[PDB]
């Protein structure tokens, strides 16, 4: 039922998922002056050299690229994390215009889009068990601004015409997610939640300070996707972001300054 429109969007999600009004909901505005530099935070370790992508799917909310996570390959650790987290999928959130689209904001600034690389804690054995845990997931968030093209994105962009509508999927092998990272791994971190139903409070968020640049043409291709299925009226997949939620009790920590 849920989606991103007037009658089913963010302001409605609490009826099916009352945690929507919980104490550790995401995204949030990152007030960069209030974030605490934490000298005890470790550099983030991103090891994606053996990542194995499997498919790409239009799920009617966004598109996912899912990875084979049955071996110890693409892993996030260090930073604020205890233990090892395995990459399972990435997706994006983006706007109808370049001035909105991100879920997190930085001093109220919205970016054109936001990339989420979703990892589960290997101590829980699989992602379905990990989402039931308060430290089950680590999501790496990367802002996108419009400027110069991101060459590492173009393989994604060029397959989107094959998954235009809800339910469509394709083969999507040998995609290297290292091509979506910025130069710097400096980050903010805080405890939060999934930003889509079921909104589980299971995520350690790690948001990189440095955005990647993508071209205007690359993001225009995201905006040609459809929310609807094949043979329903066409509704462009745009503005699939949840707005910032109350920070409540929480402290955002910075790895830098």
Whether 1 is catalytic:
no
- Confirm whether residue 32 is marked as ligand binding: no
Helix extents (H) in 18-166: 127-130, 154-159
| Residues numbered 3-22 forming contacts with ligand WWX, rule: CB under 6 A | none
Give which of Zn ion, ligand WWX, none residue 156 binds (C-beta under 5 to 8 Å, depending on kind): none
Stretch that binds ligand WWX, among 61-69, 152-160, 181-189, 211-219 (CB under 6 A): 61-69
State how far the Cα of 126 lies from the Cα of 201, in Å rounded to an integer.
17
CB of 40 to ligand WWX, least distance (A): 26
Task: Work out which of 139, 144, 207, 212 binds ligand WWX, going by CB under 6 A.
Answer: 139
Q: 5 Cβ partners below 8 Å, 6+ apart?
A: none
Count of residues of this chain found to bind ligand WWX when the rule CB under 6 A is applied:
19
Closest CB to ligand WWX: residue number: 194
CB of 215 to ligand WWX, least distance (A): 23
Backbone angles phi, psi at 105, to 5 degrees: -130, 160
Q: Does 118 bind ligand WWX (CB under 6 A)?
A: yes
- Confirm whether residue 33 is marked as ligand binding: no
Nearer to Zn ion, 34 or 245 (CB): 245
Three-state DSSP at 57 gives: strand
CA distances from 215 to 98, 118, 218 (A): 11, 24, 5
Give which of Zn ion, ligand WWX, none residue 61 binds (C-beta under 5 to 8 Å, depending on kind): ligand WWX
Torsion-angle region of residue 255: left (phi > 0), alpha (psi -120 to 50) or beta?
Answer: alpha
Q: Does 195 bind ligand WWX (CB under 6 A)?
A: yes
- Confirm whether residue 1 is marked as ligand binding: no
Three-state DSSP at 247 gives: coil
* Burial class, 1, CB count within 10 angstroms (exposed 0-12 / middle 13-18 / buried 19+): exposed
Q: Which residues bind Zn ion (CB under 5 A)?
A: 116
- Confirm whether residue 196 is marked as ligand binding: yes
CB 226 within 8 A of CB 236: yes
Stretch that binds ligand WWX, among 59-67, 143-151, 157-165, 220-228 (CB under 6 A): 59-67
**Which uninterrupted H or E stretch holds 218?**
helix 216-222
Q: Which residues bind ligand WWX (CB under 6 A)?
A: 59, 61-62, 64, 88-89, 91, 116, 118, 120, 127-128, 131, 137, 139, 194-196, 198
């Amino acid at each position: 039922h849920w989606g991103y429109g007037k009658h089913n969007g963010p302001e409605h999600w609490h009826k099916d998922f009352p945690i929507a009004k919980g104490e550790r909901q995401s995204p949030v505005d990152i007030d960069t002056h209030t974030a605490k530099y934490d000298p005890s935070l470790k550099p983030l370790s991103v090891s994606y050299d053996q990542a194995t992508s499997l498919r790409i799917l239009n799920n009617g909310h966004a598109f996912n690229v899912e990875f084979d996570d049955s071996q110890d390959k693409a892993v996030l650790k260090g930073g604020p994390l205890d233990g090892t987290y395995r990459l399972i999928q990435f997706h994006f959130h983006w706007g109808s215009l370049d001035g909105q689209g991100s879920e997190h904001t930085v001093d109220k600034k919205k970016y054109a889009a936001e990339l989420h690389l979703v990892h589960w804690n290997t101590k829980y054995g699989d992602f379905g068990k990990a989402v039931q845990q308060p430290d089950g997931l680590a999501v790496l968030g990367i802002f996108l601004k419009v400027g110069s093209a991101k060459p590492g994105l173009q393989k994604v962009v060029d397959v989107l015409d094959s998954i235009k509508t809800k339910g469509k999927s394709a083969d999507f092998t040998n995609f290297d997610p290292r091509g979506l990272l910025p130069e710097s791994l400096d980050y903010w971190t805080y405890p939060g939640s999934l930003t889509t139903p079921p909104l589980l409070e299971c995520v350690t968020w790690i948001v990189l300070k440095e955005p990647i640049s993508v071209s205007s043409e690359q993001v225009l291709k995201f905006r040609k996707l459809n929310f609807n299925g094949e043979g329903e009226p066409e509704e462009l997949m745009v503005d699939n972001w949840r707005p910032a939620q109350p920070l409540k009790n929480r402290q955002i920590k910075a790895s830098f300054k």
